[PDB]
Design a protein around this ligand. Structure first.
Ligand SMILES: [Ca+2]
Ligand SMILES: [Ca+2]
Ligand SMILES: [Mn+2]
Ligand SMILES: [Mn+2]
Lengths: 47, 181, 181, 47
C-alpha cells in the first residue's frame, strides 16, 4: 500500500454556483494513455 | 435537508444516468474517458444537478466521493495529459484540451469558469506545473495552476482508490489516493 | 451494484433536480402539482433516470419511496381527480388528464404505456373504478383500471404519510398511507 | 392514527423499461383540489 493525501481550504460558496454537475475529465496529447473509472460513489448533504 | 447519493460498481453499455462528452463511453463494465490515442478529450457527468450551497440560508453542503481509476499507458514513461474529478455549472461542456484537462482555459484565475477540480496530472507543463517535474495530484480552483499539489508516482495499469471529501464547517477539501502498492 | 438515493425535506423555488410538467412548480417550501382549479394536470419527475432492472443479469431493483402529500379541496364532497406516484419511461410526458390522472390513456391494458402507478383516486369514474364509489388507493399497471384497490377515506387538508416499497425477491409492491388521526 | 395498506404482485421487468423516471402526477376535472407534496425520499438498489 502506497498512499498520498492533500488538503486545502476552498470556499466553494464563492467559486461554484448553487447548483452544479459533477464528473470526470481526461485528456491526451502527443503522448497518451487510456483513462478509465471502475467504480464511483457520491454523497452530498445540504442542511 | 437535501441529500443526493449514488453508487455504481459496474458501468452498463448504455448508462443513462451519466452524460457523456467528447470520447467518453462505457465498455467492459468500465467508464472510458479516453482510449490510448493522441489528442483526445472525454468527460462523463452524473445526470442530476446537485444542490451544493443555498443563497437563502448560506448553508453549504458536506460531500464525499469515492472512485477507483486506472491509467493504462502503452509506455509508462511517455504519458499524457491526466484525469480530473470536477464540480462545475450545470451546463458545463469541454474546455481546452491537452494540459488544460478539458476543464480550464488558462493558468490565470478566471472567476467565470466557476469550476473546482482535483487533478491527477501525468505530464509536466513548464508554464504552470511544479518545477520538480513530478507527476502530481493538485487542487484546481478556476485555473490549471493548482492552489496546492503533492508529488505522486504513477503506477501504470494499477487501480487507484480515491476519496475526496469536503467539510463545510471548515471549507476543507481533502484528497486521498491509495495503491494496493 | 447500482444505488440511487435522494431526500428532500423542503423544496426550493429553483429545484433543479426535478423536471416539472404542466402546472407543477415549487414553493412555499412545497411542491405544488395542481392549485385548486378545474381541468388541469401537473407532474414532477426526479431528474436522474433510475436503473430498475438489469438486462445482463435479469436482476430487478429493490426500492422504497416515502413522501408526505396533502389534498386541499374547497369542500370534502366534490373532489376531484387524484394523485399518483408513478414509474415510467425516461422521456415521459403528461398522458390523458382528468380521470386518467395524467399517466394513462385507456382502461384497457396497453403494453406500450410501460407504466406502473400507485393512485390515490378521489373521484368515481363509472367506466372503471370500484362500484362501491369509495375513494381508493390503487395499483395501476398499463391501465387506469387498477389491478387491486383499497377503500380510503380522504382527510381534506391533512398530511398523509406514504411509504411505497418494492421487494425484488417476491415482486410484491406494498403501499401504506397513514394519517395522524 | 389511521392507516391503509395495499399489496400486489407486479413483474416490473415485464412492464417497464430497464431505465425509468419516477415522479408524481395530479389532475383535476369539473371538481378539483390542490395537490401538494411536502417531502420526498427515494432509495433503489440493483444488485
Ligand atoms: Ca500537466
Ligand atoms: Ca377516478
Ligand atoms: Mn498540474
Ligand atoms: Mn381508480
Amino acid at each position: 500500500v502506497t498512499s498520498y493525501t492533500l488538503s486545502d481550504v476552498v470556499s466553494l460558496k464563492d467559486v461554484v454556483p448553487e447548483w452544479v454537475r459533477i464528473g470526470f475529465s481526461a485528456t491526451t496529447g502527443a503522448e497518451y494513455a487510456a483513462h478509465e473509472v471502475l467504480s464511483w460513489s457520491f454523497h452530498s448533504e445540504l442542511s | 435537508t437535501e441529500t443526493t447519493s449514488f453508487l455504481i460498481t459496474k458501468f452498463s453499455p448504455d448508462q443513462q444516468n451519466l452524460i457523456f462528452q467528447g470520447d467518453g463511453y462505457t465498455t467492459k463494465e468500465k467508464l472510458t474517458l479516453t482510449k490510448a490515442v493522441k489528442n483526445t478529450v472525454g468527460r462523463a457527468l452524473y445526470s442530476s444537478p446537485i444542490h451544493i450551497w443555498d443563497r437563502e440560508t448560506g448553508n453549504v453542503a458536506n460531500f464525499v466521493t469515492s472512485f477507483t481509476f486506472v491509467i493504462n499507458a502503452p509506455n509508462s514513461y511517455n504519458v499524457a495529459d491526466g484525469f480530473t474529478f470536477f464540480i462545475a455549472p450545470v451546463d458545463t461542456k469541454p474546455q481546452t484540451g491537452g494540459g488544460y484537462l478539458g476543464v480550464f482555459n488558462s493558468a490565470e484565475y478566471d472567476k467565470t469558469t466557476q469550476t473546482v477540480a482535483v487533478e491527477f496530472d501525468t505530464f509536466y507543463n513548464a508554464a504552470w506545473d511544479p518545477s520538480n517535474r513530478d507527476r502530481h495530484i493538485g487542487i484546481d480552483v478556476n485555473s490549471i495552476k493548482s492552489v496546492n499539489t503533492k508529488s505522486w508516482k504513477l503506477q501504470n495499469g494499477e487501480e487507484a482508490n480515491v476519496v475526496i471529501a469536503f467539510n463545510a464547517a471548515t471549507n476543507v477539501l481533502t484528497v486521498s489516493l491509495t495503491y494496493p502498492n
